[PDB]
Amino acid sequence: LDQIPLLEKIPLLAHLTAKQMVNSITTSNWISECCYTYIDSVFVYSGWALLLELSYQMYYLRIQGIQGILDYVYMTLRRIPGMAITGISSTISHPRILRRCINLDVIAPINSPHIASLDYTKLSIDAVMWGTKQVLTNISQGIDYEIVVPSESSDRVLNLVARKLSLLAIIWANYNYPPKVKGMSPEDKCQALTTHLLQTVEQIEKTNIRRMIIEPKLTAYPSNLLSRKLLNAIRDSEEGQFLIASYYNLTEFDFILNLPQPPLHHVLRPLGLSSTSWYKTISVLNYISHMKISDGAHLYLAEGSGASMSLIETFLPGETIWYNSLFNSGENPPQRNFAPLPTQFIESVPYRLIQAGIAAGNGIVQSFYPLWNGNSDITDLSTKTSVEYIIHKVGADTCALVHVDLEGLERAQVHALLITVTVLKPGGLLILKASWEPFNRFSFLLTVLWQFFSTIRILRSSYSDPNNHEVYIIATLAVDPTTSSFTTALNRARTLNEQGFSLIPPELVSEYWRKRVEQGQIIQDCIDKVISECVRDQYLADNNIILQAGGTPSTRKWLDLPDYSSFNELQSEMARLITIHLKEVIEILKGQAGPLGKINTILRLIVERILMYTVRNWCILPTQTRLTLRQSIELGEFRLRDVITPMEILKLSPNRKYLKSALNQSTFNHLMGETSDILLNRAYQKRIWKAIGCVIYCF
């Protein structure tokens, strides 16, 4: 104690703080310790400690295989109250620890437009799951992990080594059936000790495997969580801080016109964390790359995740970039002061090159200043204060590109319009996220823009939704604008709108409709073919643009499930999963006949796990079940019976006392049919279809 070298203190501090976290879950926080230790080791030892705690429970449930342990720990973490995990949530939510976790691939910020909106409880659960997977893999390969016994200088150490031995038996329960340990003394773990040498026979370099069995690593500590001494030694030591710092340091169906449905189109978006509007941007680049917009600043109104901002910046770089999106500090996680930062732009190439100081393509380092002083009304463009502040900071006649993507005149749209009119450099470009379906609004917008813009081009993105009549306006600020003011343009636009025909010629409307019907049909056939055939490589240039922009397939971190090479093994996996995790459900159901809420949450967790199993292994499904899963998801629900049938569940799962009695089988079939079907929100549907696209693209 206290005599180990400095190189050994940091992993020991990580082990001790991980033990503290695990005891906490099974204002208090651990940022002080985690900022001065190995955060990846912290989560690895957290997984190790949680595995030690759950070893006996998983052994008495006859869990087999690494994935069985992973599913059990996932549901255990998902079933704890959110107040209990707030200790780990607070540590992860800290900006330094958050960036550390992101950079060590432990944490990926997904499904949140802003960092402050991230589900840090789910984020902590994901980190602990990653640590558990790392521990299981390292144990399987033979990397033994030290067990610490604080407050011991007995029998509890013999129990702890028994927990580790039972974990090891559980890992290889497929090859050989583990013996019973129920109702047995902590000393009689020698039976398990003996059978692990038998299991070791059935595979390479066994020396490390056997060493962790016969000679378990153990380290008893007379003091108790000891961690404070290690933390003080690390902080005081100069090298220690030096060591910590060193450790942590093609779709061409788009067309241009120069002047309540399932989100199936997201499958064609197989890249990107959170929003993926760069896909709608790709078609814009094909027309705006010819002209010059790099000079001058760029302004992005309501950009949100900043995906379009990133992909515009990589190929069209600006000197100053003024992000702007709606955000209030009220939705921050406790004890955090997160600014509105686009969680997709921060991990992209432009911000990664800004932070490390490398120059951009133009040779001028991009200066990224979000428009945020602390007022929620300031982020909301409908307020006049927002307009005045935005115009103040960017400066009138300072920028050349303005990207307005405000979703569907409303006060915010006209406010965004005269922000641009005031701030664009003469000859500057505006890209606008219009909408053709309310044609009156379209005529109004076209007239007001035409008063002071020239070369107004209407472009429908080939990657946009085929049902929303979306149009991306491509217009240039007219040189030498002699327009009196914005209000005259607006009032006069009202006149034309209420006194005469719309400025759009009927021939252009007919052309738009004629190209729109064929484009929608073609895109729908492309989506249908991609979902059905599941060809791995389709439209490589578009996704290559995303990869150059800094986008990566986010299915790796959201879908950590394995990729079975056979469909029979897939079905067998849920045959184990359902039969293992419905035991509690049946137990409480028989006990009561409060509990119904637990029943429902366990059922929902099981069905969601089955859903992600299906999505991860979507490619290897036969086309018939692929088709029926697509049909089920289209109405917005995930029926469990399509993937696997109750007779298959009974056949492909080990025989047990559960699922053995006529009443038990009857209630299993009752809970097995439509009564366990779950519903999916629209954002959930986009998540699922994007994940399917990612799986197809990567497999």
Author numbering: 1434 to 1459, 1478 to 1604, 1609 to 1657, 1663 to 1685, 1688 to 1711, 1736 to 1745, 1772 to 1920, 1929 to 2113, ...
Task: Give the authors' words.
L and P function as the RNA polymerase complex, responsible for replicating and transcribing the viral genome. To catalyze the RNA synthesis in both replication and transcription, L sequentially consists of five domains: the RNA-dependent RNA polymerase domain (RdRp), polyribonucleotidyl transferase domain (PRNTase), connector domain (CD), methyltransferase domain (MTase), and C-terminal domain (CTD). P harbors an oligomerization domain (POD) for self-oligomerization, and the oligomeric P attaches to RdRp of L, tethering the polymerase to NC to extract the RNA strand for both replication and transcription. Here, we resolved two L–P complex conformations from the mumps virus (MuV), a typical member of nsNSVs, via cryogenic-electron microscopy.
RdRp-PRNTase is quite conserved in structure amongst nsNSVs, while CD-MTase-CTD resembles an appendage of RdRp-PRNTase with great structural diversity. In MuV Lintegral–P, the appendage is also less resolved compared with the body. Different from the conserved RdRp-PRNTase, CD-MTase-CTD of MuV Lintegral–P adopts a spatial organization distinct from those of PIV-5, though their individual structures are pretty similar. The detailed alignment showed that MTase and CTD in MuV Lintegral–P appears as an integral on the PRNTase side instead of the RdRp side compared with PIV-5 L. The overall spatial organization of CD-MTase-CTD in MuV Lintegral–P is surprisingly similar to VSIV L. VSIV CD-MTase-CTD is highly flexible unless unphosphorylated P locks their configuration, while in MuV, no P fragment is resolved around the appendage. In MuV Lintegral–P, an α-helix hinge termed Hinge-1 (L1416–1431) connecting PRNTase and CD has been visualized. It is supposed to provide flexibility to CD positioning via loops flanking it. Compared with PIV-5, the spatial organization of MuV CD-MTase-CTD renders the helices α53 (L1439–1458) and α57 (L1535–1544) of CD rotating upward and leaves more space for RNA to access MTase. Actually, MuV Lintegral–P forms a continuous positively-charged tunnel from the GDN to the K-D-K-E motifs, ideal for the RNA synthesis followed by 5’ capping and methylation, which is favorable as the transcription state.
